[PDB]
């Protein structure tokens, strides 16, 4: 799958590395996921299950 930095990624904190998942879907997060990026990217989207 394709991961991306969540709002919780960047700093050195537990769970680090790009652990979320990006959705190319026009609204990002699919029903069954949650959300993990209130913003970036500016094309597709970034969420987490």
Curated annotation (Swiss-Prot):
Places the protein is found: Secreted; Nematocyst
Primary localization: secreted
Example of a GO biological process term: regulation of signal transduction
GO cellular component labels: extracellular region; nematocyst
Site feature location: Key residue for high affinity and preferential inhibition of sodium cardiac channels versus neuronal channels: 12, 49
A molecular-function term among this protein's GO annotations: toxin activity
Top-level taxon: Eukaryota
InterPro entries hit by this protein: Anenome_toxin (IPR000693), Myo_ane_neurotoxin_sf (IPR023355)
Keywords: Cardiotoxin, Disulfide bond, Ion channel impairing toxin, Nematocyst, Neurotoxin, Secreted, Toxin, Voltage-gated sodium channel impairing toxin
Disulfide topology: 4-46, 6-36, 29-47
Family: Belongs to the sea anemone sodium channel inhibitory toxin family. Type I subfamily.
Protein function: Binds specifically to voltage-gated sodium channels (Nav) (site 3), thereby delaying their inactivation. This toxin retains the greatest capacity to discriminate between the cardiac (Nav1.5/SCN5A) and neuronal sodium channels (2.5 nM versus 120 nM, when electrophysiologically tested and 14 nM versus 400 nM, when tested by ion flux), whereas its paralog Anthopleurin-B has the highest affinity of all anemone toxins for the mammalian sodium channel. Its ability to differentiate between cardiac and skeletal channels appears to be associated with domain 4 of the channel.
The protein's name in its UniProt record: Delta-actitoxin-Axm1a
Source species: Anthopleura xanthogrammica (Giant green sea anemone)
